[PDB]
Design a protein around this ligand. Sequence first.
Ligand code: CL
Ligand code: CL
Ligand code: K
Ligand code: K
Ligand code: K
Ligand code: K
Lengths: 292, 292
Amino acid sequence: MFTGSIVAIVTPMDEKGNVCRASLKKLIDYHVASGTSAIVSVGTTGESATLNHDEHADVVMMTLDLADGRIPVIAGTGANATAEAISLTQRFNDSGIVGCLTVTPYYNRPSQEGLYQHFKAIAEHTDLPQILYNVPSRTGCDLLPETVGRLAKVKNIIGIREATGNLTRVNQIKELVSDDFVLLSGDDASALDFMQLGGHGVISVTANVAARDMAQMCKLAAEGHFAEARVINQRLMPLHNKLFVEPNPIPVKWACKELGLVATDTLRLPMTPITDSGRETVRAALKHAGLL
Amino acid sequence: MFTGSIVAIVTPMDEKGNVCRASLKKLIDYHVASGTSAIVSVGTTGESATLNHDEHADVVMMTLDLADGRIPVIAGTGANATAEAISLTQRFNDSGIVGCLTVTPYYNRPSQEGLYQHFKAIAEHTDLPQILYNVPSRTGCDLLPETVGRLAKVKNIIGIREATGNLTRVNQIKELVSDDFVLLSGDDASALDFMQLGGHGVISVTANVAARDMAQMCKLAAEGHFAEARVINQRLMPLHNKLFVEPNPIPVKWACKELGLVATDTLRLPMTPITDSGRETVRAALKHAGLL
Ligand SMILES: [Cl-]
Ligand SMILES: [Cl-]
Ligand SMILES: [K+]
Ligand SMILES: [K+]
Ligand SMILES: [K+]
Ligand SMILES: [K+]
């Protein structure tokens, strides 16, 4: 399922930075019970950066196992080397995931033609649906609408997580692609505007801690009840902003720990523990949201 | 050696995308003859993004063997996971490289504290000199002078490649570090200006194809003959710019092949072959530099 509220799930860790199965189970039961549409496993928020490919694969498999068919799982499969992205996709074929979330190469700043060839080749070597992921503030390159339009002609490239926060992109992309191509926000604070403009959902960081409210907001938006959805969005807005007061996923792991959804808020370097002031900011946002 | 003209050397490949030994030797001989001060092996220009760690180590080791003690070799060791950066660094411990060039974590956007802890930990697991590398347009994060000052207190953190193109950084960092802390430009187009402000040299892309001029310019600059160095710079300025007409290292690899320095201009996806319009642009810049 590639519409509605999709959670970019944290990878919960013990004190030693190892994946905590018990916290993961809890998170997954929480999203099943709250009506989250799907789980994105080991994306940015899941600390893809600091897991090796074995741990990455382990987390995804464990996620599917715990999900036990109750919720669709999408694996983060992005890499800045095309051969690496291809190889990582192969690890997940026939695993039971329903699709892949695949980021524009970061750091090496390819041209639009190179992004085209990158994603074309990945899609070529799998039957799994591919969701493109554009986030220029992290990657240093910007996948423009024109190129999204080219890639949408490839059979199994089915959508895009658009994280520019630039809402003019929704209709620039939409007019170049077919009506079954999915447009998903990757910027929590502007996601409802994104959906009001034509977007079909959100791959969300906020959904980690406000799953029910996010699920309902996305359904209201899809039904066109934007004023109703906006009341919810207004109570989540401090969370939408303050979950990035410090680098994601530092605030969201702390929030998960504070709600008792995970055992520890541990991350791997270069991520560092939340500051006292950040705890204060985030706790205030959780309260504004009515979660505490 | 950590002053003067230091080349961020390309990793020449055969048509299969694997390291081309004959081309590498030719490049290293070229830099020996030209008075280049040192080689950075497998940094960004050397396609650190698309080589796996074993291939990366292979290239560094081959470069060192080929250098045969004639010219100092610095290993690119950057990674966005701290554990990974330590592991890559350890491959080169007791190897014959004289130092490491280590970039701020890309993509995951750590805090200043995160950056401090990342580089502190790397430095603690090695005796090799460390050169920090700041390039926010590639990484999505910016290592501020205050944090450079803090890291410069670590025994084996000895300099910075500053690639913001923001010249105000030279004296901001200089006033916070000791006088043997090395300041190196990472932006060819502004590198002479950088040196005029008190910079000690450049880790250069242009030096791949204009090594003699680059060496002479940094020499004149170190002697305080800025008027005279500037004549060289003006001759090289179209290269400083047009070597980024297409994503680095697409133009400089083509330039190398055109100058007969490497056998092929092959790169690994997502880097793509230079366009016809790019060939003409780089050719005019080479001609302006008097190299064609
Ligand atoms: Cl994410
Ligand atoms: Cl470089
Ligand atoms: K296919
Ligand atoms: K399609
Ligand atoms: K790599
Ligand atoms: K030092």
